[PDB]
Structure formats: C-alpha cells, structure tokens
C-alpha cells in the first residue's frame, strides 16, 4: 500500500527531475477503499503482483492529492485510493524554493562616469532646504569663514583659540558660533525659523539637528560633552544620514554606482569600511540581486556588528563581519591582503588624519583592478552644514592634512591622492553641479595595476560593407602596432594560405553577410579554420539579436565555443548602430588580457547599445520565481492593489482568506464577453451569492473610468478582487449616492440573496427563512410582498423568535404550516440541527436551502435582475448607517474565518497605493486561465511527450484547439480523445516545418478543417547532433538549424503581419539554455537556439507577440526521457538544472504573459530597439545554484554572465 | 448491510511521553452474514 | 446508473466524475434506492456546477404522506411513450 502511495509521487515527479523537493506524508487520506475478497485471494494466489494506475490531482506543491487504483491480472479492483493528501513533513521553506527562472539583467559595461539620475537630483524643496539656513547666514558669510572653522575646531583647539575651555568664554563663543548664521537680525528668533523648517519635509533632519545640536554644543564646545550624543542616543544623526535629500541623494547615488559594479564585476569580495549603524549598507546592499560572494561589515568600532548582525540577517549566509581600523594596516588585523573585489568607504576617510595611508591599506586588501566606492565630504560650502559637522570628535582630526578637518577634498584632490595611493583616479563621480551633494558625492576608481593596455598576431575578417569597411579602417588606424591580416571574407580566410595559430581575430562578417545566412559557402569549413587557427577572437555584430537573427545565430555558436575550447577566447559585439568605435580594439586587447586572480573579467559578450557598452547577466527573476513557487508554498509580494488585480482568496482547505494576486496575464479574450468593464473596486462583499442559478457573484462596489472619469458602480463580480473584469451585463451603472459608501454594497448583497430566494423557490405560496440578517430579513419580506410570496422570518438570536437546540414538537406548535420551501441563512452551524428539525416538521418534500446554498467562497443577466434589486434596496436603505459592518481587506484576511461567513459585512478595498501596498499571497502563473477558446495554438514541433503534456496542460488553460506538427506526428488517436474530454479538440497536423510548401499546406489544412485562426505557436522542433564544430559537418549544421532556424523563419512570414484579423498572442521558441550559456558539442543547437531568440526578439520589436525560454534538462518529458538520457543529464546537473513537466508548461506559460505584456507595453509605446530592453522575452531557465565547490566540473562557471547565480564558497 | 466505525491509531513514541494521535477516520463496511469496485481507467495511453 | 445510461459505479473518485459527468448540469436527482450510492452524490456536488439543485430519492419518493387534468394527461402520454418497455407483471407482489 505504501508502493501505491508513492505511485502518486511517481506521476508527481519523474526520476531525475526534484519536483519533489520537500518530504511529503500522507496525510489526509479522503477515502481508501479496498475489495478484502480480492485483496486475499491476490495475496494466496502467488502472484502477489498486480497492477496499478494512479492520478496526481492535485500538484501545486503545497500538498500532494492522488487518487489510486490497484487492480488484479483479470483488472479487478482490489482497491483504490481517493485524493490520499500527501503533505510536506515540515513546511516548505524558501531553500526549498526552484530557482530556474532567470533574467538577462542587462547593465552596463562599466559604471557610469557620472552618477545624475534625476530621482535623485537636489529636489527644489532640497533647494529651498538648505538655501533657507543659507539666507540665514549669508549676509556676512564671507566675514563669517574663518570663524565658522574656528568653531569647527571645537574638538582640537577651539577651546584654546579664545580659551573657551572655560565655561565663560563657552557660554560667548558657542552663541557666537551660532550667531555666525543668526547674527543678521535672526539671532535667536532662527530657533523659530529653525523650527518652521523642521514642520515639512527635505529640511526636517539636518536643520533638526542644528537645533538639537547647537541648544546644547555648550559643553561640547569646552571638549566636555560628547559632540553628537547631546542628542540621547543618536536621535537625529542617523535620520540625517538616511533621509536628508541632500545627504540622501548621495547615498542613492552610491547604491546606483555600486549595482553597476556588482552587475557588471558578479561574486565580488565586497567590504564596507564605515558602516557603522549600516544605513550605507542598507541602502547600497539593498540593490535587489547584487552579485556579493561575501560582504564584510566593517566598522572602527565592533559596536554596531550586533545592529548589523540584526539588519542584514538576510545577507548573512554571504556577510561576515570583522572590524577595520584604516587608521592601522588591515594585514595586521586579519584581513587577507589584496582578497576583496570591492571597498566601500561610507563617510568615514574623513574620520582619519592619516588619509593617504587609509587608502594605501584599501588598496592593500582591494585585488588589482578592486573597485573603491567612496561617499566622502568634498568641496566644502560655508553656507550649509556648518553646525553639525564642526562638532564631531574625529571629523577634525585630519587638520593635520592642511586644510580644515580632514579637509573637504575636491574631486581633483581626491584623483591625485587617489593615484598616489595606488588606484586608477577618479572613474565616476555624482552629479554636483548645483549644491547639496558637496558633502557626501560618490566616486568609483579602481585598484590600478598592470591592468588594462588601452602582442600575438591579430587578424581582421570582413570589412566588405561600406560600414564594415569604415570598422575595419578605424581598427587599422586605432589598433596598437601588431602584426596585422586583412581579409574581406571568411571564405577568404579560408583560402588564405598562411595563418597564425595564435592569431587574435577580429571578425566584421557578421556586419556583413553572415555566416549562417551562406553556411553553403564552406563558411562552416572556413569557420573551423578559424577556430583551428585562433587563441582570441571577437565577432561584431550589427544588432544582431533586434534586426539580424542570423548574427544572433553566429553569436550563439561562439557562445558555444567559448565552452568547448576554453583556451580559444571568444568575444561577441552586438552593437544596434554601427555608425556609432574604438572600442572593438579594448576588448580584443582585452581578449589578449587573462587575469584570471584579479577583479576583472573577461567580458565574454559585450552589446554596443545607445552609445553606451553593455552587458548581460542572469539573474534569478523573483517575480516569476515567486509565481512558479506560489504554486507550492505561501509566496507573498508587495502588490498595490489598487491598481494590481488582487483577490481575497478562500483557502484551498477554506481554513481562511488571504490576499493573492488576481492578474488574469492579459488573456484577449473580451468579444464573446464582450466590453468586459474594469472596476476598481472600494467595497465588496466577501461571500460570492447564488444569481438566479447563473452561478455564484461576488456583490462589488467601486470606481470604473469612464473619459477620466471615476464612475461609481455596483456589479456582480467573480472574483471578489481589488479590480475586477466583469461584463457589463453584470453591472449597475447609476452613481446613486443612497447606494452609499460600503452600505450601497451591503444592501445590494442582501437583496441579491433575497431574489435569489424568492426567485430558486417561485413554485411556492410560503416560505420560511431561517436566521437572517435584519436588514436581509426586511429586505426578504420586501421582496415576498413583492413577488406575492409569503415569506416568514424566524431568528436564533415580526422575526419568529426561535431558539437553537428547540424540540421538533415546539417548532410544529410555533412554525406555519403553510410553508413550502426553507432557506437556512445561518451562518453559524448551531442551527444546522435546528434545520433538520424544520424538515421533520415541515411539509413533507418540504425545498431546503442552506446558507451555502446562497452564499459561498468559491466561484471557480436581465437589466430587469439589478433594477428589481436596487428597487428593493431602495425599501429599506435607512435601516442601517453606511458603515454598518466596514473592515479592510487586510482585516478581514487577518480575522476572517471561512466557516464563520460573516454576511451582510463589507470588505473596504485600500484605494491609495500607499494604502493598497500590501504583502500580497502570489498567484500560480497557470493558475488562471491563459489562452482563448476561439483560437488554434500550434505547437511545432511538440507531438512528443514535451509537446503532448504543453498541449493538455493549455487544453487545462483555456486552448480549445491545439494542432501538434511534426514530420512524424505519432500520437494516439485516443490521447486526442483524451485531450478533447479536458475540453479541447487536438489535431495532429503532420507538419514539416522544415519546407516553406509543408507548412502551407499544414496552415491551409487548419482551414480545411475549419479551426479557429492560429492564435498562438510552440515553436520546439528539435534535431540533435552532439558534435564538435572542428568534427562537425555542414550537413550537420542544416540538418539542426533549418528545423529550427528555418521553421521560425518560414512561420514569422506567414504571421509577420501586425495588422491582421488574428495576430499570434504568442510566438513562443523553445530554446535550450545552452543557447545562454553554451555546451560543448552543441554549438550547432546553441546557434539555431539563438536564431530562435533573436527572431523572438525582432518580431516583439516588429510590434508581434513572441518570446523565447532557455529550457534546462527536461527530465519529465522530452528526448531526454524518450533517449533515457536522465542519468547523462544528472551527471552534469550542477551544469544544466532539471525543469519538470509541469514546470516546463509554468515556464511557457511565462513566456506567453511576456509576449503579451511586451505587445501591450508596445501599446504603451516600448520600442524594444536594443537587446537591454528584451530581457523579459527570454526566459533563461534550467540553470541551478551554482556551488562553487563544482567550479570545476561546471564549464561556466568563469563565464560572467551567470554571476550571480552562485552559491556562497565559505 | 452497512457498519460505520470511527477509528483512531494513537501513538506513543517513548514511555516517558503521553499517548497522541497517529492518525484518525473511518471505516464503511459493505458485510454480509457470512467488481465491488470501479474498473481501473484503460491504462493511460503514453508514460515514459 | 451504478449497476445511453452513463455507466457509473458505487466509491468512484471525485476525478473520475469531473471527467465523465457533463458539465452542463443544474441540476442532481438521486433516485438510487439503495444507500450506497449518496457517497458518490456527495462527489458529485463537489465535482457538479457550484450550487447545483439536489434531490434525493426521499424527496421523490417517500413511505409517509401524513391537481390539472392536464398533469395525469401528460403523464399517460409519457408513459405511452415507453409502455412495451417491460411485461405487465415486472415486480409485482
Ligand atoms: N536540454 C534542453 O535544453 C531541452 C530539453 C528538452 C526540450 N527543449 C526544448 O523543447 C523543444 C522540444 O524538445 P523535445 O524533447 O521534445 O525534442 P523531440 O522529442 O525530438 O520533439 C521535437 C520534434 O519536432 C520534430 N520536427 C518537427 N518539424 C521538424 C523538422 N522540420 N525537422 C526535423 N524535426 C522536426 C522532430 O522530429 P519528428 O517530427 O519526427 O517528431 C522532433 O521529433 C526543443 O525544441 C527544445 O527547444 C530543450
């Protein structure tokens, strides 16, 4: 029997695959039922060997339900099992969580030289912030300076420069201090002024300090008090670190620079000197998916490390937290000597005299070419942070430098002490051109060394297109003295006679006619060549992924070979204008370049986009990861549902309700259900109510726009969500201000429940109904009197005053006997007894109807139905104040209980995204509805088990017709008949996608079978020849590009219209994930995998619905499992992650929303121009936690591109 | 022809703990004094 | 029927009505005179559209009691229908 139970799991999960990644138990077993008869005769037969089969209702993941069937020889049952519950032995945690889903964050190739986001520019209220305390000031400024340094020196030698070290000369000099802002007539009344700033926001902290600071820098001013404690426990110092929007913007600034870096430089030692409380921490680390391989917290002061150690729980798997003192070499106080990536100094270089020395040590534990990002005071202005900073008891200390307190270094000083210390000067800088960022601007410089060279033989291919021409000029001119070949054409190349074995090439032929596009020309043979002849190499590309898939298809061979012959660098330059140079000689001298132990990397594929070098990294895409995972544990995210599509969700088990994600992912089905109006919605009502035997509606008031304009409404929703999508059949339009706020709601829901009452039942001439609400109680009798129904009331708590747990005999003495039909409203249980009773005194045959009947949780029309209601409410709207029974959403999910409906109460919807920000239970991607009934999806390719599970999967999502093609479309004529009883016909089209002539006959076919117009292509068509390019042959190449490459170019022309009736909701190619990173054998694949994703790629870009996934190892379903290569793959997981069945179908699924959210985007005007603007098209996917502990057996783990994607290593 | 009885497996691991529960349900009995069941689905068609 | 009839059978699971039974009922009438089967309406009110109308056996047919012409005509015309479907002794006692 405990075989049979894992039968479940087994249709749960394939071998090889993990879909069972925690420990599941049978837990709730809703009904075994076993023959004993056959069950022993089986057991003393012999045999004691019997078959079985078995159904995984239920898979989401949080808990297994199957249901099993064990049968004899002769197929007796001898017994089976129904929705037997598995549940997790403990419950499962985010480690447990799947992280095949990954993005190409695309960022830049170095980060910016300046730092200007407008966000965070000195705001204007900034700019009335700090220029108010200047007005202040300003009248005697100048006459002001060297006094206000004198009160600066407050900690070294102010209270010897007019011997106020005595209390007299205090109590003068500290007002005096002070006076050198207020002494133009302010005086003391700026305490008020002072004041008037702290009321509002962008002047609040820094003023607020002056104040706080300048009431009491009397004993601090003698060098008695503390400077900053003053203020108990540090009460606005941190506020004016973290919040001030001149301080702030600094720190924004620093967190942008350092996002860039880790982007770009992935697994970086990274250590923040000056952390302290951690607010630099908390902002720069706060970048979400940063490539940190250990953060070392670092502070003078160990104190903080426990604040920390609290702060940054969630980074600790990857922080440590060791104390640094810059003042003393790091070397001597454990720290690894020149073993961090990157250095964060955070405000705090200032808080040392010995400066040049401090940034000596950082370059010391920084690697050659290690990134120092320093937030430091610069460029000193009188006029503005004269008060607070003059105080500190170490800020001054740095005098010794020369200049006031560690002095304000200008950027210019900053490159030169910088340089002297051993970096590369000032790279980047914050934007300062006004004000305000002075104290606190960001700079990046790295740890220079040897480094870049801004030797062995360099070859040059193409130059044949006047622009490749001019590209191969400007290298001729720009490029180093070396030894040089020219050759206009790969097939040139291939007839040279003599070449460098050693050579570094630089290859234009992608910028002209491309290899894939004249493999025919030998350019394959000549390709080999090249591989044979080359030790570095970089291609140029002309925006290969956006306009030339052939290019794109050159690109992902030699992602490819980047794998199978490591020593063979290969670089790619994929650039969207080639008129807009210079750099193509960096990175081939890059190429030259391997400094495999120092900070930078090889850069293996670089994008010229909008002027700017760019690159690309997979990063685990947490939205979606979020959503595949939802479908198995409790994902929350922060959703605005006011503006997001978010619904108070029962629970599976109905235990309670919780806010999930209600986005329907763009399903375009809205002409059958024609005009389906959006409601925001402000109030609803929690219970769905039966309509007239239509179904179960959930009553939902709210705003719907109309020409701008926030129409009240009141419908009958299906979803009980913030917004909803309901059609206007189902809608009362009028903004009937009696229908009040939350009241309207709650009238309405109760005379939904009345004329669902008097209509189930009208055929009767009375009715009892059992425990109503009052108002539904009035509103009941309304409608009998109405409708001519005589309706009585009869209440637990006129209304029949009964009594839960009364005798049958009281209830005949009190109920009439006239009554027909009960209608048991109760939400409370107690009464169900009640009920029974009723029955036995009732009529015999007496219509019963319980509260569930009328009111549930779960959903899964006449104009005359809502008038006839409104018309009811309007009896009895004064019963009851608007807000009779009113509590948020966020409320009723917290309190709520399922089995306690509480009817007649009104959920209060947040409006305001501040309000409606809320964590938010995430949604299953297919967890909803996804495809249309009246269009055909035509997976090519997918008649094997991959396709045939993608298609009834869809079939399951809304895909009423599906059409399989392949060459060889072996599928059973019952498995269509299978599909078709999930609700939707299957065909079999016999496509070779391979012949322009075969796919038109295929799509003319469609026709002749008079199916809906292709909506939607599953482009997988696969051929495989694990190979080596240098033993592959050509016949090879085409026999796995044209498949692939030539299928997706064949069906992009025959839907490469935007403007026809029925264009493809989605174009979806079935790319491998070496077509991201590569495999060796598999450059052929990897290549027609890219052709895929750039053809992908260009048509979004065309304005047509299309996207690609990366697919890792599909161990479910696939060549893997008909080829029994589960084993082969495993062998290599850590390589290539295992993406199931189902997990295969979330991923397409994915894939499809991203098509249609990028045709909608591009409704809303995105251009897609670049290839950083179509990460979202590709979803890389099969890629595990890579553990450093393989690096060696994982080929790519030194590629960059899946930098962030690995496990800590200590 | 019908016996309906609640049942309740309680388990306890060591003799130093309390008696718990393991598992609970019930069992129909279909007696008598001395194909009962559906016909299993046709073998479903293709699994790898 | 648990012995055209759509073919059912007593303790079948909830999945295994979902796929034969259709979709497009309202309504649910348990005429099964033996007890065994209400298990089985019971799934069938999980698997049945939400809210479905229900009516058992006892609700048609019952051992305690405690009209249009138009109805007993249309009766025997029904019964007209499907008269020779049995002898005229089937059950009788
Ligand atoms: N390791 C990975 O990354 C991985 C793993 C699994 C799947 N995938 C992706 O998912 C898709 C399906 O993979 P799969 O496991 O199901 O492979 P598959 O079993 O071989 O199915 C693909 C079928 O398309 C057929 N086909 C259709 N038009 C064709 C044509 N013009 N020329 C040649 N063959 C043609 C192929 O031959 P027949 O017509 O005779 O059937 C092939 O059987 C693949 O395209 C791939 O992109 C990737």
Redesign the interface.
């Known amino acids: 029997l405990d075989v049979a139970f894992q039968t479940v799991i087994g249709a749960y999960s394939?071998p090889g695959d993990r879909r069972l990644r925690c420990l599941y138990v049978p837990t709730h077993?809703d009904?075994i039922?076993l023959?004993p008869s056959?069950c022993l005769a089986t057991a003393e037969s012999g045999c004691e060997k019997v078959?079985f089969?078995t159904?995984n209702?239920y898979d989401k993941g949080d808990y297994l339900s199957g249901?099993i069937?064990v049968?004899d020889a002769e197929?007796?049952?001898?017994?089976?099992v129904?929705?037997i519950t598995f549940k997790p032995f403990s419950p499962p945690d985010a480690s447990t969580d799947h992280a095949m889903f990954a993005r190409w964050s695309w960022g830049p190739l170095t980060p910016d030289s300046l730092l200007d986001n407008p966000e965070y520019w000195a705001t204007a209220q900034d700019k009335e912030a700090i220029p108010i305390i200047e007005r202040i000031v300003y009248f005697y400024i100048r006459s002001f300076l060297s006094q206000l340094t004198l009160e600066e020196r407050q900690q070294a030698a102010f209270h010897l420069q007019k011997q106020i070290e005595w209390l007299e000369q205090v109590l003068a000099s500290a007002k005096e201090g002070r006076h050198l802002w207020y002494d133009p007539g302010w005086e003391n009344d700026t305490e008020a002024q002072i004041e008037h700033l702290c009321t509002a926001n962008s002047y609040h902290p820094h003023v607020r300090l002056v104040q706080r600071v300048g009431q009491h820098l009397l004993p601090t001013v003698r060098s008695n008090g503390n400077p900053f404690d003053l203020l108990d426990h540090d009460g606005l110092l941190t506020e004016f670190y973290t919040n001030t929007l001149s301080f702030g913007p600094a720190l924004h600034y620093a967190r942008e620079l350092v996002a860039q870096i880790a982007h770009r430089y992935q697994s970086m030692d990274i250590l923040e000197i000056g952390a302290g409380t951690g607010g630099a921490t908390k902002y720069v680390l706060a970048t979400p998916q940063l490539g940190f391989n250990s953060y070392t917290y670092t502070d003078i002061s160990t104190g903080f490390f426990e604040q920390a150690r609290e702060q940054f729980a969630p980074f600790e798997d990857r922080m440590v937290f060791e104390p640094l003192d810059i003042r003393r070499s790091p070397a001597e106080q454990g720290f690894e000597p020149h073993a961090y990536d990157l250095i964060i100094a955070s405000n705090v270089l200032h808080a040392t005299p010995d400066l040049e020395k401090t940034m000596a040590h950082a370059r010391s534990l920084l690697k050659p070419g290690g990134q120092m990002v320093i937030l430091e005071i610069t460029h000193k202005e009188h006029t503005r942070l004269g008060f607070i900073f003059g105080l500190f008891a170490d800020w001054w200390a740095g005098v010794d430098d020369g200049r006031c307190t560690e002095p304000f270094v200008s950027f210019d000083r900053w490159d030169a002490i910088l340089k002297r210390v051993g970096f590369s000067g000032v790279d980047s800088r914050t934007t300062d051109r006004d004000a305000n960022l002075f104290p606190t601007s960001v700079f990046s410089t790295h740890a220079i060394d040897a480094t870049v060279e801004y030797y062995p033989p360099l070859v040059v291919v193409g130059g044949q297109t006047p622009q490749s021409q001019r590209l191969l000029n400007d290298i001729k001119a720009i490029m180093p003295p070396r030894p040089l070949q020219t050759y206009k054409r790969l097939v040139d190349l291939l007839d040279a006679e003599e070449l460098p074995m050693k050579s570094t090439f630089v290859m234009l032929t992608e910028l002209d006619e491309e290899l894939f596009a004249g493999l025919t020309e030998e350019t394959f043979e000549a390709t080999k060549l090249l591989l044979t002849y080359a030790s570095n190499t970089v291609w140029l590309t002309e925006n290969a992924w956006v306009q030339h898939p052939h290019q794109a298809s050159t690109i992902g061979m030699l992602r490819s070979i980047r794998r199978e012959h490591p020593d063979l660098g290969v670089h790619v330059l994929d650039v969207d204008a080639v008129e807009t140079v210079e750099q193509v000689l960096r990175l081939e001298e890059h190429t030259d370049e391997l400094a495999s132990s120092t900070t930078w990397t090889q850069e293996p594929e670089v994008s010229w986009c909008k002027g700017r070098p760019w690159i690309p990294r997979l990063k685990r895409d947490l939205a979606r990861n979020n959503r595949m995972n939802s479908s198995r544990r409790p994902i929350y995210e922060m959703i605005d549902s006011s503006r997001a599509p978010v619904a108070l969700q029962t629970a599976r088990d109905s235990s309670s309700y919780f806010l999930e994600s209600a986005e329907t992912w763009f399903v375009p089905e809205s002409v059958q259900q024609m005009e389906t109006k959006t409601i925001y919605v402000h109030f609803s009502c929690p219970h769905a109510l039966?309509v007239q035997?239509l179904?179960?509606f959930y009553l939902v008031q709210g705003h719907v726009q109309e020409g701008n304009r926030e129409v009240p409404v009141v419908a009958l929703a299906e979803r009980n969500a913030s917004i909803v999508h309901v059609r206007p059949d189902y809608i009362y339009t009028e903004a009937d201000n009696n229908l009040s706020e939350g009241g309207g709601s709650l009238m309405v829901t109760v005379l939904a429940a009345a004329v669902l009452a008097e209509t189930?039942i009208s055929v009767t001439d009375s009715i009892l109904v059992l425990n109503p609400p009052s108002i539904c109680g009035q509103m009941l009798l309304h409608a009998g009197e109405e409708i001519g129904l005589q309706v009585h009331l009869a209440t637990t708590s006129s209304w029949l005053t009964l009594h839960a747990r009364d005798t049958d005999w009281h209830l005949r003495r009190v109920l009439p006997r006239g009554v027909q039909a009960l209608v048991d409203l109760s939400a409370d249980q107690s009464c169900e007894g009640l009920t029974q009773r009723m029955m036995k005194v009732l009529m015999?045959?007496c219509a019963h109807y319980r509260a569930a009947?009328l009111f549930?949780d779960?959903?899964?029309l006449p104009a005359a139905y809502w008038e006839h209601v409104v018309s009811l409410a309007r009896q009895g709207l004064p019963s009851v104040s608007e807000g009779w029974e009113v509590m948020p959403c966020t409320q009723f999910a917290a309190h709520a209980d399922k089995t306690r409906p509480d009817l007649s109460t009104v959920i209060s919807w947040p409006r305001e995204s501040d309000e409606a920000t809320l964590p938010t239970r995430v949604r299953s991607i297919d967890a909803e509805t996804l495809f249309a009934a009246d269009k055909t999806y035509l997976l090519v390719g997918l008649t094997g088990?991959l396709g045939?599970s993608l298609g009834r999967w869809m079939v399951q999502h809304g895909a009423c017709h599906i059409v399989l093609t392949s060459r060889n479309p072996q599928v059973?004529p019952?498995?269509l008949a299978?599909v078709e009883?999930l609700?939707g016909r299957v065909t079999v089209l016999s496509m070779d996608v391979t012949s322009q002539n075969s796919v038109e006959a295929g799509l003319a076919k469609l026709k002749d079978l008079h199916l809906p117009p292709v909506g939607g292509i599953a482009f997988g068509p696969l051929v495989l020849q694990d190979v080596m390019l240098n033993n592959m042959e050509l016949p090879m190449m085409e026999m796995v590009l044209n498949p692939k490459v030539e299928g997706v170019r064949i069906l992009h022309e025959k839907f490469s219209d935007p403007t026809s009736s029925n264009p493809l909701d989605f174009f979806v190619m079935f790319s491998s994930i070496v077509a991201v990173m590569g495999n060796p054998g598999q450059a052929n694949y990897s290549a027609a995998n890219c052709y895929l994703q750039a053809l992908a790629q260009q048509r979004v870009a065309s304005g047509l619905a299309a996207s690609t996934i990366d697919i890792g190892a599909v161990y479910?379903?696939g060549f893997v499992?008909?080829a029994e290569l589960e084993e082969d793959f495993n062998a290599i997981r850590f390589m290539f992650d295992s993406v199931e069945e189902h997990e295969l179908h979330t991923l397409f699924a994915e894939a499809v929303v991203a098509g249609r959210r990028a045709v909608h985007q591009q409704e809303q005007q995105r251009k897609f121009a670049t290839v950083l603007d179509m990460a979202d098209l590709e979803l890389t996917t099969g890629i595990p936690p890579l553990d450093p502990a393989l690096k060696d057996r994982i080929t790519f783990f030194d590629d960059p591109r899946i930098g962030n994607l690995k496990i800590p290593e200590y | 022809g019908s016996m309906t009885i609640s049942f309740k497996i309680d388990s306890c691991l060591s003799k130093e703990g309390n008696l718990s529960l393991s598992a609970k349900?019930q069992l129909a009995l279909t007696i008598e004094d001395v194909?009962?069941?559906?016909?299993?689905?046709?073998?479903?068609?293709?699994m790898?």
């Open positions: 394939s077993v009904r039922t023959v056959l078959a089969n159904i209702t249901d069937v049968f197929q007796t049952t001898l017994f089976q129904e929705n039966r035997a179904g179960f189930v015999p045959g009947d549930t779960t959903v899964s088990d045939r059973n019952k498995w299978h009883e609700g479910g379903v499992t008909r | 349900g194909h009962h069941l559906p016909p299993p689905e046709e073998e479903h068609p293709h790898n």
